[PDB]
Design a binder for this molecule. Structure first.
Ligand SMILES: [K+]
Ligand SMILES: [Mg+2]
Ligand SMILES: [Mg+2]
Ligand SMILES: [Mg+2]
Ligand SMILES: [Mg+2]
Ligand SMILES: [Mg+2]
Ligand SMILES: [Mg+2]
Ligand SMILES: [Mg+2]
Ligand SMILES: [Mg+2]
Ligand SMILES: [Mg+2]
Ligand SMILES: [Mg+2]
Ligand SMILES: [Mg+2]
Ligand SMILES: [Mg+2]
Ligand SMILES: [Mg+2]
Ligand SMILES: [Mg+2]
Ligand SMILES: [Mg+2]
Ligand SMILES: [Mg+2]
Ligand SMILES: [Mg+2]
Ligand SMILES: [Mg+2]
Ligand SMILES: [Mg+2]
Ligand SMILES: [Mg+2]
Ligand SMILES: [Zn+2]
Lengths: 54, 42, 120, 111
RNA sequence: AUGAUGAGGUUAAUAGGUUCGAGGUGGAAGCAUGGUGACAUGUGGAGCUGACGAAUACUAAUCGAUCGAAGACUUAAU
RNA sequence: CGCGAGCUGGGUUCAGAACGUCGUGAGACAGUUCGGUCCCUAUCCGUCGUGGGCGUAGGAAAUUUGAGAGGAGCUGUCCUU
RNA sequence: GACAAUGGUAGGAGAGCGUUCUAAGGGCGUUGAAGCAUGAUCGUAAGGACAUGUGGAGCGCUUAGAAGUGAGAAUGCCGGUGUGAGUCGCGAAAGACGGGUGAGAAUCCCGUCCACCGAUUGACUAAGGUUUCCAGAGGAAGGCUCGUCCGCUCUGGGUUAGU
RNA sequence: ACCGAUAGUGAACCAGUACCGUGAGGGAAAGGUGAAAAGCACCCCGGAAGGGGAGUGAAAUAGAACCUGAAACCGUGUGCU
RNA sequence: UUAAGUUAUUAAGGGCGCACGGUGGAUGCCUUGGCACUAGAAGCCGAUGAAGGACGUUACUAACGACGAUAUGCUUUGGG
């Protein structure tokens, strides 16, 4: 359960490809156009979702 | 349990200044500490 | 069905607390799964308030908590009273869907998805 | 022209900051703000303050209009460490490193 | 396991609820009646019923966003 | 005498004790007997499953032959002739 | 010029490069020393110069002398940084909601509901520790998370005996 | 023809200290802004830290463990692949 | 157009070189301090209370140093 060999920079970096995070499920809010928000989520600014304040 | 269960009395009636100066060799201890320079004796 | 990081009895009590708190407050801020499970509880309770029988009060007391809410007439009232007297009278034409959910967004501490759940 | 703003001795570790910087690097400023403000990672507030500082002192000092701006290079460098100790068993210690970062964000108008 | 695979995304029956059922439990609560009482009987195969079948837009699957071709050269037959 | 980073640990093979025998004795015996702590989060190959990238000279959806690979491969009793 | 020799361990012999200091001599340097970095530079080798960037004050060169005189290994010593790896783990356990506070809230405050102990997880108390008590401010580090909070940090107070 | 901060005293610095141990006893690490403090008025972002401009300074690429600042190490951009 | 053949482009990410950065604290320069010694002096203190320490004194006082309820010092003699 103990490595015999150090892990090179090359292998380290080849493994750290898929560890990244992605751009979130982002969209615009049409109440304010800009101030992009998450899709299927309330807008923090406009308090809106399908026009209605919340 | 463990091996140090403190007591002020048992600390000072063994390792204390008076117990040192009560004895010929315990005075050499204080001299070795006075000679070395320890701020705390006993 | 669904289990919520809790054993069976803890789940039952959490669900009763959420139902009752909803009945009091008309909207609560929770996590989406607990919402998705307590909507069933709530809606079945509204159905009992609509059936309106004594046996239905007796069966909804098995699932509600004994709480005291002060009214805007400065009056003392219970969850079950509020339910069978106000909430089931609001929805007398509505055949289900007594509750909605609004996905709010990811919470700071635990990365949880907060929601708002209310009984419109 | 160029503007930058920096944040030094940040408590977060660089492997956990660079994940977010990879989303900002080479994008419109408002887009990037939204990325940070909607990502639930914990470095994203800090990156956001570095960014808004850059936009502010571009708008102020170097006199550029905030609209046309993109994020040219956003990089994070290892700072110090704070060496700490988590006692594991049988009298053995195990080291802990409270790593640091130097969040830099450089802003340009494209010329 | 996660990705993924598959059913669906308002021109919508995908899930929840609601109304019906199946299967299961086995005769609710209240009222009355006979008993001193424990109980028993009737109303009534009662009421309850998580996952299964069907119908139903009541709630949520909103508005949106991104990626994704214009098809190399040569030779031969046409 | 395949396999204890896959198990056990009866047996041998530590320290305790006792019998026979040997030894002046400490102690000893492929003599016997009672008892007696089996550590590890798998880096690489390997293996079982599962995905992303690109490629397959346009970009896509579906159906597909099969170079190959793997699997299965057992056998009784009875009746009739 | 002719001719020949020139693999090499333990090992013997010889000729040398370099480092620190010193004597003498001759010299460089804020118009930029040493040192560091870069280069496609010279020498048969150890190794030496030249430029450019940095740097900001000492340093070479010749001959000779003296040594704390050259490191890749000692399960070497001290420090620094990594791989394992964003991986084990985050330390027996019932929390939920509402209102606040605030830049920031699962985590702080208040209320309610639920739960846990209950020969007790309660009350007192000798040792021991010795100001951790209290109040108001703070959030760098500590807290195995967060933190507006704390047994942490700042300031200021607090322990009253004839029995 | 002694060291020059892993050297030289264990100790260039509040060192026989901190820390360890019941105790005798053991026993560290840690130097340098600048000529002078002239130690960044002031505006902007930020809750703050931190930073960007401005101004002191010859120099801040000298801004407080502040002379120089190697290597391991961590990264960003890109020429060939 | 079809058939046959040949070949590239891609870079998720990696390698080599270069440039820019950071951490880190080697090197160079320096020295408040030390080492070995030379010459000269001296070679003890204390019951008229030692050496060594504890507690305290400052305007504000945590610590080192000096000091001692005459306490961050008193007097005098000279120097300056
Ligand atoms: K904090
Ligand atoms: Mg139970
Ligand atoms: Mg221990
Ligand atoms: Mg074997
Ligand atoms: Mg084993
Ligand atoms: Mg075996
Ligand atoms: Mg063995
Ligand atoms: Mg005998
Ligand atoms: Mg034997
Ligand atoms: Mg036993
Ligand atoms: Mg030869
Ligand atoms: Mg030879
Ligand atoms: Mg040597
Ligand atoms: Mg994780
Ligand atoms: Mg692993
Ligand atoms: Mg815990
Ligand atoms: Mg307190
Ligand atoms: Mg030293
Ligand atoms: Mg040095
Ligand atoms: Mg420096
Ligand atoms: Mg005078
Ligand atoms: Zn909006």
């Amino acid at each position: 359960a103990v490595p015999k060999r150090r892990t090179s920079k090359t292998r380290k970096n080849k493994r750290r490809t898929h560890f990244k995070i992605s751009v979130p499920g982002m969209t615009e809010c049409p109440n304010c156009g800009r101030e992009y928000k998450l899709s299927h989520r309330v807008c923090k600014n406009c308090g809106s979702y399908n026009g209605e304040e919340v | 349990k463990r091996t140090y269960q403190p007591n002020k009395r048992k600390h000072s009636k063994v390792h204390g200044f008076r117990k040192r100066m009560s004895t010929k060799n315990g005075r050499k201890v204080l001299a070795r500490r006075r000679r070395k320079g320890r701020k705390v004796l006993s | 069905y669904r289990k919520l990081g809790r054993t069976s009895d803890q789940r039952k009590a959490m669900l009763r607390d959420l139902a009752t708190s909803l009945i009091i407050s008309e909207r609560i801020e929770t996590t989406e799964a607990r919402a998705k499970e307590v909507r069933s509880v709530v809606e079945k309770l509204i159905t009992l308030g609509k059936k309106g029988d004594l046996a239905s009060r007796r069966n909804a007391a098995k699932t509600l908590r004994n709480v005291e809410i002060l009214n805007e007439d400065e009056t003392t009232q219970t969850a079950l009273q509020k339910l069978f007297g106000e909430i089931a009278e609001r929805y007398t034409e509505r055949q289900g869907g007594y509750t909605r959910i609004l996905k709010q967004g990811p919470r700071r501490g635990d990365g949880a998805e907060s929601v708002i759940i209310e009984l419109v | 022209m160029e503007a930058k703003a920096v944040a030094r001795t940040i408590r977060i570790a660089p492997r956990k900051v660079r994940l977010v910087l990879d989303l900002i690097r080479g994008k419109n400023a408002a887009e990037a703000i939204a990325i940070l403000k909607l990502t639930n990672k914990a470095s994203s507030p800090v990156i956001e303050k570095v960014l808004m500082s850059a936009l502010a002192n571009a708008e102020h000092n170097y006199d550029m209009n905030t609209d046309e701006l993109v994020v040219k290079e956003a990089y994070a460098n290892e700072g110090p460490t704070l060496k700490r100790f988590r006692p594991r068993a049988q009298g053995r210690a195990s080291a802990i490193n409270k790593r640091t970062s130097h969040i830099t964000i450089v802003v340009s108008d494209g010329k």
